[PDB]
Amino acid sequence: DAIAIVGMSGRYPGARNVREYWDNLVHARNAIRDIPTSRWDVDKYYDPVKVYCKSMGMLDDIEHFDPLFFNIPPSEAELMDPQHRIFLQEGYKAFEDAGYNARTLNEKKCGVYLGIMSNEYGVMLNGNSFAIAAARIPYFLNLKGPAIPIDTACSSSLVGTHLARQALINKEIDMALVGGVSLYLTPESYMSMAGMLSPDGQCKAFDNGANGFVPGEGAGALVLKRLKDAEADRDHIYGIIIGSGINQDGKTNGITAPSAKSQMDLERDIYETYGIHPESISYVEMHGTGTKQGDPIELEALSTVFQEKTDKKQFCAIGSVKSNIGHTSAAAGVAGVQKVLLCMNHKTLVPTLNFTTPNEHFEFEHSPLYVNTELKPWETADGKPRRACVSSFGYSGTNAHIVIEEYQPESALFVLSAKKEKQLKAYAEAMKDFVTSNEDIDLEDMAYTLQTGREAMDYRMAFLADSREMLIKALDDYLAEMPNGSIFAAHVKTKKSEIKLFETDHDAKALLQTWIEKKRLEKVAELWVKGLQIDWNKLYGEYTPRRISLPAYPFAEEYYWLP
């Protein structure tokens, strides 16, 4: 039936994670920049009539990777497509976002569906096949669900989402990691213009001045489960997918042209099959690439299908995050789904950018659709959950469309760990920022997530806090190396002898069990950082706190590029 999204991770232009992404969206920030010479020299390719676009939505530090984390020899990292490397990281973090770790994922029937559409790095070099790109994560985590890369161009990650959905519903897999990744590494590939790109370097979605898209880079991942499992497993749930479908344009006027009829059929068939009334939908994240003939066709299609079922006018807001971050290609779908989920979570609609005058080829006034350019509350009538759609169409003519519905649910011991001390320090910094930024965090939930929802790695710290302020201070004290009697830290490999007593002796174990039983945290803390395995479940009696979203592993930022 319904598919729960229980984890997410994202890395987009101007946004190192989905929290920065959200902030950028709320503040209507445009992340498109001029392409610097450190990528390539636009002056050597630029002609205004060769490339006619000099702008891109760029990721930062596309060369950074933590190969040791993934048991990859540093020398192999130079030979890896950075698309592979970045997704490997973002995929992993999506799992951690959900609160799953290497231990809990081992041998899971989790499918991996990865949107990817370019080979630039592999060619530059003359390991890097699409088949291997998808398989990295399964290999690393010992997952057992199929690993399939999807190249349907810009619809790729949304196509992957559909396929994962059908596999989960058919009970062929019990979890799915779906994602996309797109980089533009060469003048040659970003180049193909074929007339596709805007000379101004903006996706002017819905606007009469729409004249092409600006290429964007990105990597995103979602963790999907059957809703029934997600609730039984007490996952945190971002939203549910209640309908999806894919189809083809077929014969168009040129293989890259869109078909109004196919878009309508796709949308109609989904709504009919899954019993979804257009009136119930209040936002659609359009494909919205800002092409002159594409935009009006998408608008007319969607408008027409909505109007078949309702006379209501201007109830459904439309937007496109491509106005913010550009056209992130294989990652477009996942970028859009993540926007919608963040909107739902915050019950907030955010501005779509670059919209001055409506596309002349479409009349909004008597449409069910309106372009939202405001930061405003996302209103819902009565009890009803918010519903939104995401569309993604590819240049090869393979379309996708999904429907998402908002999910309506019915002292603590903080522990951190990393594979190196430097990353542990980075982790503490990330947690401090997170806690500083989120004044309403549930402290018991957060600890519980750190305990059960992260792998205990070799470098460890832990501390007690009963308040946000105490929590922030502890992390400050840790970072400043300023003495605090409630902070404990150790490298596990150093402390083996100091722990053995609690691992082998029967009454020491009984004492440890009573400590965890008779509620003492300082003692549990000291032992934990030294490497003692704690049974975290015993810490909780009648009341068990829930996993929540926290910052994921802060990978080492080591530079690797062509050998």
Add this chain to the structure above:
Amino acid sequence: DAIAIVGMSGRYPGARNVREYWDNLVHARNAIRDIPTSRWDVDKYYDPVKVYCKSMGMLDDIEHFDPLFFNIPPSEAELMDPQHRIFLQEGYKAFEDAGYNARTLNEKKCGVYLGIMSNEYGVMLNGNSFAIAAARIPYFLNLKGPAIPIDTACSSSLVGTHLARQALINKEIDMALVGGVSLYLTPESYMSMAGMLSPDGQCKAFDNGANGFVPGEGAGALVLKRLKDAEADRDHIYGIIIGSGINQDGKTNGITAPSAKSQMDLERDIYETYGIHPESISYVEMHGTGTKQGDPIELEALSTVFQEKTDKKQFCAIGSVKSNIGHTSAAAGVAGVQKVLLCMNHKTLVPTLNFTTPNEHFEFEHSPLYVNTELKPWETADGKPRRACVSSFGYSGTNAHIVIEEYQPESALFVLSAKKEKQLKAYAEAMKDFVTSNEDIDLEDMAYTLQTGREAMDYRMAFLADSREMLIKALDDYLAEMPNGSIFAAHVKTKKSEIKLFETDHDAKALLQTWIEKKRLEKVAELWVKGLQIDWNKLYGEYTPRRISLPAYPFAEEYYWLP
């Protein structure tokens, strides 16, 4: 029958509007200047025996346009012939001069007849067809009458006037925008000398030293209606067209030579068809280009036709504004008509320039005609309305001649608005200058015109005044941002919540309606600036004021040229 001229707008050398035009004419100012290097370098083309003229009647700021006002993307502005852009502005302003706005013009059967004769910008670039030049305004305002460009060279705008008149009389349209526009952008075009140009750079109309014309630039528009409609609609009326005709030179000695016989026939046929006696005419705005063989032929023709009917001598003044502003080509006719209307309105004849000694080939003394070189009152006998003619002849041999007759008619709340705040400030400045210059302005008429005869746009200010002095001070206060409790100003998009109450509630509406009916102007003002729609008609009971000519929109002065 009679055609009323109910709106005008003009932009000529030395005159940004028809008010500056009038001032220049009254003061016998010559607007011809040496061609600056910012246009082209005359030294690179100049040969005295190549160009042999270095002078031009030039428009200022031919590159300026406000594309956002017209819902045109800024980048499209660079690709538009400035002839199109300038006429789009003047044409619009003519409508506003008449007191008509987008709302009142929507779906109107208004024909647009546009004099235009050159393509320089389009060629320079290698949207810019004559057909599109004419269609710009209809497309913007949603007019439904035919949109036709006319290229009969120099007679163009007068030919258009004839066609509009006939369509109006035949009830095919209910309004007409007629105009012309000419620019001289290249050395090549302005160049064609073909022997046409004066080496001295003056149009020496009627003078024995006449030796060619000096090219001038210009853009001018008129608003025409049937007189019966204009009186029923309570338009303000500049004058009435009581006759017009067009014909051809046919076979001449060279296709650009004039025909005495054709000019006589044209004039004779018009006077006979429409029952106009030459004795009733007291001024003729001649084609008067200051060419050696052209001038005497025109004089002899007109003199002969007049003399066929009367023995009276030297009763009809002749002149040519080309002596002031040069030969404005496609806009020549509208320039001439506008001069005559202004003369009529002020009951004043103005000097024609560059006249020292009469052309030897014509004897004035026993003619009905005399050259007026004086600023003097336009005298009329008995009750009789003043009558004048305008001639315009083209190099292709298509001639035009119209007859115009003087029209003899049987605290306030000031509101201003623009699409940007900067233009609002420019609007207030223009109004202050206008009121300062026009000491006799009817304050009630003016307010009424601002209320009913201008579109309420997004940036608003309003105030009360019961005198000219109070009005001027209010505007000064607004401009100087110095506190004045009777001044209100808002951006409408910002205030939506503060207005909704008066839009939905039944008793609030009844209060607002009572306010409007009891003339509670402060209250009406505060609400209007915030975006509340006011039914202005309710402000007026037994006495309704009349629309008058006021300054029109002050377009943003943004520079656009070749991409």
